[PDB]
Design a protein around this nucleic acid. Structure first.
Ligand SMILES: [K+]
Length: 137
RNA sequence: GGAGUGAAGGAGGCUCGCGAACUCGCGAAGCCGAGAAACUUCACUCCC
């Protein structure tokens, strides 16, 4: 829809047709976080499961190496979401958290799930745009 | 692109306007939000 000049300047810093690496994304976080507070960094993943069946639910917990324990539970549309840190954190701590969340999802891959498990993975901030990442990077 | 729905983030968001101890701070300036609802993100469903 219609966005303001703060967000439109954030879109002139990202490439929609580029699969970023985890280290590139974590370094990009500070530039994509321009709201008037310390924003939260989020990881979103579209899962390769059938969310209409009860046996393919992805629901667990994981202790991130920088910050406490987080909870993750897939939605009925098939996607999964989790806060992985704040935007004032050093890039290496953010990249370590993104990697820890990815492994945690992959440790709870259900039987009966078909094909690629992490179909798309994105990194974004609270009030900013997203960047698609390679989860195996 | 439009109308909705779900989850997750979330205490701010958008528009203007000046001011110099540093992309930052102020304003009895309007509107929206701190209610599920702003704003942002991944998805889902329908429509030209
Ligand atoms: K967001």
């Amino acid at each position: 829809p219609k966005h303001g000049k703060r967000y439109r300047a954030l879109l002139e810093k990202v490439d929609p047709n580029k699969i970023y690496t985890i280290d590139e994304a974590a370094h990009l976080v500070k530039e994509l976080a321009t709201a008037k507070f310390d924003e939260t960094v989020e990881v979103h993943a579209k899962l390769g499961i059938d969310p209409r069946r009860s046996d393919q639910n992805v629901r667990g917990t994981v202790s991130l190496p920088h910050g406490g324990r987080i909870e993750f539970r897939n939605d009925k549309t098939g996607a999964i979401h989790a806060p992985v840190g704040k935007a004032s954190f050093p890039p290496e701590k953010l990249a370590d958290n993104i990697r820890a969340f990815i492994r945690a999802l992959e440790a709870h891959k259900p039987e009966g799930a078909k094909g690629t498990f992490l179909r798309s993975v994105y990194v974004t901030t609270t009030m900013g745009p997203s960047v698609r990442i390679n989860p195996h990077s």
